[PDB]
Amino acid sequence: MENVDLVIDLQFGSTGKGLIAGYLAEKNGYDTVINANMPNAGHTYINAEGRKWMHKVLPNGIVSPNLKRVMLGAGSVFSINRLMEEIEMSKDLLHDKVAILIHPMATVLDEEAHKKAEVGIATSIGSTGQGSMAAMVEKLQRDPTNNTIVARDVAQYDGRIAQYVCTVEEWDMALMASERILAEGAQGFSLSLNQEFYPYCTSRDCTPARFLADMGIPLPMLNKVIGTARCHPIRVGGTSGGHYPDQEELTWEQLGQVPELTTVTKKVRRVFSFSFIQMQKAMWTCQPDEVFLNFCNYLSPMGWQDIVHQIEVAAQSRYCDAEVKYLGFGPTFNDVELREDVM
Amino acid sequence: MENVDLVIDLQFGSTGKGLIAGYLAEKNGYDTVINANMPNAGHTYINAEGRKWMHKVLPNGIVSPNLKRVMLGAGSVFSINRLMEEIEMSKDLLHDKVAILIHPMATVLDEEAHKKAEVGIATSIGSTGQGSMAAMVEKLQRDPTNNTIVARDVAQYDGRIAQYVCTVEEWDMALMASERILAEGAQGFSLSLNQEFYPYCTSRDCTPARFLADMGIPLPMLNKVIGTARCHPIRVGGTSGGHYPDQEELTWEQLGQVPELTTVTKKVRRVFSFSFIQMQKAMWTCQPDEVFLNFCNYLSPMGWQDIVHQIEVAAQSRYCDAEVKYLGFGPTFNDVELREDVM
Amino acid sequence: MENVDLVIDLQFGSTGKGLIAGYLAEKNGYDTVINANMPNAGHTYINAEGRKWMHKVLPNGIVSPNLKRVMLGAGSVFSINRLMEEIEMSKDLLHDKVAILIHPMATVLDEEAHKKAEVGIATSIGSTGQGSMAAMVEKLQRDPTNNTIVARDVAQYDGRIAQYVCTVEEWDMALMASERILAEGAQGFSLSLNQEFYPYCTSRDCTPARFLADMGIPLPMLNKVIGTARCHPIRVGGTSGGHYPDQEELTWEQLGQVPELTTVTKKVRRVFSFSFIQMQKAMWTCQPDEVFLNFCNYLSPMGWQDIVHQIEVAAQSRYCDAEVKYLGFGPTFNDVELREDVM
Amino acid sequence: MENVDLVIDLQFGSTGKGLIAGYLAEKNGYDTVINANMPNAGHTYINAEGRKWMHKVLPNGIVSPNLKRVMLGAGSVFSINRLMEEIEMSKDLLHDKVAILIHPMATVLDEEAHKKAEVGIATSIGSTGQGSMAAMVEKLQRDPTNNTIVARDVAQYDGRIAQYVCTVEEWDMALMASERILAEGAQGFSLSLNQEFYPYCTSRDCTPARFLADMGIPLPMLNKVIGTARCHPIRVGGTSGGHYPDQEELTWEQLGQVPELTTVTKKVRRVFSFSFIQMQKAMWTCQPDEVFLNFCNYLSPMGWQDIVHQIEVAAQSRYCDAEVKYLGFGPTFNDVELREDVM
Ligand SMILES: Nc1ncnc2c1ncn2[C@@H]1O[C@H](COP(=O)(O)OP(=O)(O)OP(=O)(O)O)[C@@H](O)[C@H]1O
Ligand SMILES: Nc1ncnc2c1ncn2[C@@H]1O[C@H](COP(=O)(O)OP(=O)(O)OP(=O)(O)O)[C@@H](O)[C@H]1O
Ligand SMILES: Nc1ncnc2c1ncn2[C@@H]1O[C@H](COP(=O)(O)OP(=O)(O)OP(=O)(O)O)[C@@H](O)[C@H]1O
Ligand SMILES: Nc1ncnc2c1ncn2[C@@H]1O[C@H](COP(=O)(O)OP(=O)(O)OP(=O)(O)O)[C@@H](O)[C@H]1O
Ligand SMILES: O=c1[nH]cnc2c1ncn2[C@@H]1O[C@H](COP(=O)(O)O)[C@@H](O)[C@H]1O
Ligand SMILES: O=c1[nH]cnc2c1ncn2[C@@H]1O[C@H](COP(=O)(O)O)[C@@H](O)[C@H]1O
Ligand SMILES: O=c1[nH]cnc2c1ncn2[C@@H]1O[C@H](COP(=O)(O)O)[C@@H](O)[C@H]1O
Ligand SMILES: O=c1[nH]cnc2c1ncn2[C@@H]1O[C@H](COP(=O)(O)O)[C@@H](O)[C@H]1O
């Protein structure tokens, strides 16, 4: 029954979850790909031939040569317009023998109302202001007179999603039928609503237990957790929040890199030194089996090799047998290296 | 590392989670007891000598002869006044060598405001109207200017909870130091926000994955899941929601029992026949290792023995090897029997 | 042929013979229950639902779900009025397919005369003064002219018992037909007429050999002997007799308990410390296979656990392989525990 | 621990218990011989050389070549004068390395008072009038002011028995020390106080369970039961009582024998035909392992051989595997034959 490989971020998000999800999908050929994304940010994957996917709704694992099911969990908050654009963009991949299943309880984003309600926190806590929490709050209100927030009710008047919206039993049966599943997490461990930076955090916990719960995955189904990290963790710009005591804020100049910016909001990313405290904390809760260390291209061999050893010792210190198996030297499939081959 | 025994409700709540938690605490002598309750639920335990505990905040496992830690998770919503009364009533048990730890991110209930904000859902969806969701929404708002909703901020002006409010690292360390842990879930599987009865449900998922996430417990720590059920499941009074296709609403009269009243509202409970569909669904997601079948005292031996076999076949049908280990015949410790000893 | 389970008291009586008899009857479902009580003893059983039986005549095992026969041996001394009240109170249990058999030679108590003849020993030896010995003496006189002492003769003029009074052959046949039998002893080992406290003793031996003889049970029929004991043995009020050299008289005050009152006389019970000498003596003669250690609720875990080990070593010392199988923590069915489950 | 061979009568007494006890004592060489006789009647043994023992108190097994202990049980009723005469008569056998132990609770017969009290029943029920029951009644009265009935109290003023009177613990220890024990019963099965002929019966049950109880022998100690019978059962003269439906009263003339008389009272013995009903009844309760068929000298080979087969079929019919091992053709050791040798 253990057939779910779960992808999670060990720092403050934007580490390369999309890159390893696409890479693992191409290598392991999962028949089911599942997620529970909110409109916060888009994940990128670039394959060997240079084709690029930027997803806010669909999992990045749709590039799997054995794709049979694409499932969007109960914890999802999505723009119907975005989902339509994303499906159409990968129509060749999402063919007649691929089933797209939207959980009946997934939240439909009202872009007019939900973005307007997040205008204040977009400045005060440096929030993305995408409407994710405002939509989540409307769901929680449980007004029986409101038939415009969950997918099951929206499907009654919006036929664009109607074919995809399934029942709870159809959802359970699809997981049961699945041979091998790729589950994709979002945001990052330190962004968790219940980690130390509150209120400078996101609207949910970004931990394996919360992701499985938001995707409706039974715990005995979990096979492996693949954690992702950067050599220099980033945080998204403005009054976004603090850092750990053993890390310092850097500049893109110090690193000799072109300043990194968010895709749509064009907010410059804040960059920090590696934090061993952050790793111990993330290793304790997230307990990954395998680690993908990305942006090794910003350091020299001794620098990224030293971080590999730090991560493995951080894991062991928190009863975790995490192995840094993959190393990222660029944004493409061809830039993902096996650790054992480069060091 | 696998030392967490988790107690969860397989139906619509109020099945005897309080009773088995107290029973297991006395038998297994856990050093740590942990929960993440909201004010919408109350749990009862009665020991061999007739002492009674009715808890809305504190775990029921505080009766453990080796109690060292009492921990209230980040997912908790609590009335400070209630916590003070619950502590005072078990002051003999909660002695100088017992540490009470309230997660810094646990929510402090604003009795007046939060209850006022749930007037309406209390009638429309048959909600408890205890303020649980309204408090949860205020936390989610993440207003940096609001220092009155999370325990960490409230402790700065309310010295009643100040000694108990810990840091995130203190929380992680307490779990790490623990020898054996009793984790107590609340509400019930079918009350989940993401199960089929939405909006006639609670404000979170009532599944093992969500409980571990709300208590901040790493997944490799889970040892055993003990699922609880009744021979005749119950719901709260009013327009509380629908039922499964294979079950029917009954009356206390039909059962020959004195009408049951809800724990928080002095309201009459709705009673239904046993549902095999509900069991298959609960077994699939919750995957319990052991089952406590309670209220066998409302049936004849053939009746409750037949339900034991139904539960085990429902389990096997959903790849779960659940064993009905305990049988309940009354509200006290002495009424919990080993299934092996009675059938 | 070995199908008789015999219940006997290892000390001075009133240790919980009634309780274990009811408990074993409910668990093992004996078709035949047999005794040979005199009016000097009363035995109590309280079931899981709170129903109480206090018997001076009828066995306590009438609560057996497979009851077919209730037999009162040749050694019985009974008040017809009492037997009628005891039958009436359990008329639901003693239905049309339950045969009550009174041995033809059982003694009918002459309340006025027999009680008048025990005035004196009631003060001098602290006797119950119930008429037991006086009735027994009248039987022994064997006056062919006396048709008012044995059941067989009384039945000729007293139609209340006539249907129940059987022949000797009917008695033998009922035992032969029985599948599984529960035999209940009375008083206690140290009250034996032939133990060291004479004349401060009862009018017969309270040993397995005497009970089988008084119930007319062939010796190859004996399967198992269940001996009963208290952590602090008791005696009746007054000049009831001495104790063993290794034990001391206590007070209910010293024990922190409400003073206990005797079953027939509303008199205060004398309490003593546990005697290892009494156990060795009782184990030697009575040779029990299983032991029920009752009133563990008057001690702390170390106290009652230590007495369990004393009993087993006292047993081994007298070539007896007695196992303390049951532990009593209260007066009801739910308070009987398996020793294996609590220590 | 199984080392007690018990001798019992299967009819109405006077069958040859003394003859087989002496025979078995000489053959098996028991170190301990035990009994619990009342003054009712004397048992006879005649050895190969013609020496004769007529005992009312001492066991007949004192002829054992390995005699170490002679024990008189708590159930004994004896004349001190008789015991003195009997010991003196066998002084050569009861030497310095043989210990005589009288149970402290054995009854001392007051020949003046106890015989006078039995004058009425000696005529009415054809009783022996030896005082046995009158002495037994005085013991049962338990008057603390009476120091003249039990051996322990009589020893304080009658030094003739003082050396022999032991404690209860000395009694238990002597049985424990014993290698092989010969236990001798008295009277006979059909004479039992609780058999069908009441009041034309004796003052106790004449069954293995009552004899072991009266001798204070633990039940696990029983090895073998040797039952005794006559080809023509007798009953002791006068208005002694009835018989079984399948037997008839005969005359000594019909048998061609000299009329049999009691030793002291010179009462002619009543003689009856063999009763198969009597055997079935005796086999059921007494369950003997071996049978001694005596007075085969009053019949022809086909007559006594036919009774052997009747007895074995009677045994089998009552779940008894009794083997008629010994056949009696006279009153002497030399007259006891092994069955396998004569048929
Ligand atoms: N090692 C790398 N060097 C340079 N650019 C990279 C590397 N790995 C990934 N990228 C780019 O980093 C950017 C930031 O990540 P973004 O959130 O947009 O998607 P992602 O890489 O899949 O990250 P995540 O899914 O963790 O949010 C992406 O545009 C991606 O193409
Ligand atoms: N077998 C039973 N028969 C009768 N009453 C019972 C039984 N088990 C529990 N009870 C009582 O019925 C009620 C059912 O519980 P509701 O909260 O009230 O459950 P709980 O045991 O208190 O805990 P939980 O809500 O977690 O199930 C409680 O008041 C409890 O004491
Ligand atoms: N563990 C216990 N703790 C407290 N009370 C008990 C316990 N066991 C029995 N009792 C009660 O104390 C009394 C002791 O019994 P006494 O006759 O009264 O014993 P019994 O159980 O009634 O039978 P028996 O005389 O054969 O021992 C009874 O009233 C009984 O219900
Ligand atoms: N087969 C026999 N033939 C003739 N006389 C016998 C035979 N066996 C025993 N006797 C005599 O029968 C008589 C009657 O028995 P009595 O009670 O006096 O002693 P017992 O033979 O040992 O009998 P029991 O011990 O059974 O009472 C004795 O005097 C005895 O010697
Ligand atoms: O996917 C993500 N990548 C990076 N930062 C994120 C992501 N999601 C949320 N955040 C950060 O989390 C905080 C709160 O985000 P919100 O959930 O959009 O309100 C802000 O500081 C965001 O920049
Ligand atoms: O402990 C509980 N027992 C039973 N029903 C509950 C409990 N908690 C919440 N509910 C149900 O959850 C829904 C809303 O209650 P609320 O979560 O308190 O708002 C209703 O359908 C209630 O009946
Ligand atoms: O059931 C009983 N429990 C306790 N003592 C008893 C019981 N039956 C008899 N006795 C004791 O036996 C002696 C005489 O009581 P009697 O047998 O009723 O005459 C006294 O020492 C009593 O204390
Ligand atoms: O040892 C015995 N042999 C034969 N008859 C006996 C013996 N003991 C008692 N009886 C008979 O038993 C009856 C009652 O005897 P009691 O016990 O002496 O009063 C009478 O019919 C006696 O003849």
Ligand SMILES: [Mg+2]
């Ligand atoms: Mg991103």
Ligand SMILES: [Mg+2]
């Ligand atoms: Mg409840």
Ligand SMILES: [Mg+2]
């Ligand atoms: Mg009693």
Ligand SMILES: [Mg+2]
């Ligand atoms: Mg004789």
